Ligand binder design. Structure first.
Ligand SMILES: Cn1c(=O)cc(C2CC2)[nH]c1=O
Ligand SMILES: [Cl-]
Length: 149
């Protein structure tokens, strides 16, 4: 058995949906990310109120790809005044640090049966950018991602 993820009691988990495969590559290379203004505010509030008592996990998926591509942990608050245009499109203001934990394609078929009670019971695979995942469902997703081969 594997009862690791079943044990954590503090932590918050968010879906990250990227349109760009380049930006995923850049995120892995430099351990940084940026969301929309509204998404940045959501992640920043979750990070800051966590006050180091537990992780903020980011579950990454490219829009339309049919799979998740990996897992990262938030590693700083959001810096809103940084160099513009560093991503594939010039639509982003700011930067926060991440640490990629897992880089692996996990098909949506492995995850579509986990549904989010806070998003109308929709499959976790039908989420939008910075959709938050309830911790009990997040533990289930993390275990499937870790166990996929
Ligand atoms: C939806 N989406 C993208 O497609 C690309 C980015 C990059 C700045 C990191 N962020 C984002 O939220
Ligand atoms: Cl929860």
């Amino acid at each position: 058995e594997n009862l690791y993820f079943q044990h954590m009691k503090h932590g918050r988990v968010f879906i990250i949906k990227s349109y760009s495969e380049d930006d995923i590559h850049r995120s892995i290379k430099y351990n940084i990310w940026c969301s929309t203004e509204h998404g940045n505010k959501r992640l920043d509030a979750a990070y800051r109120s966590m006050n180091g008592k537990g992780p903020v996990y980011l579950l990454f998926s490219v829009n339309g790809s049919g799979h998740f591509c990996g897992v990262a942990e938030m590693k700083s608050a959001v810096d809103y005044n940084t160099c513009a245009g560093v991503w594939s499109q010039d639509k982003w203001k700011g930067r926060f640090d991440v640490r990629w934990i897992f880089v692996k394609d996990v098909p949506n078929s492995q995850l579509r049966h986990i549904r989010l009670e806070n998003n109308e019971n929709k499959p976790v695979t039908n989420s939008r950018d910075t959709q938050e995942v309830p911790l009990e469902k997040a533990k289930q997703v993390l275990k499937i991602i870790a166990s996929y081969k």
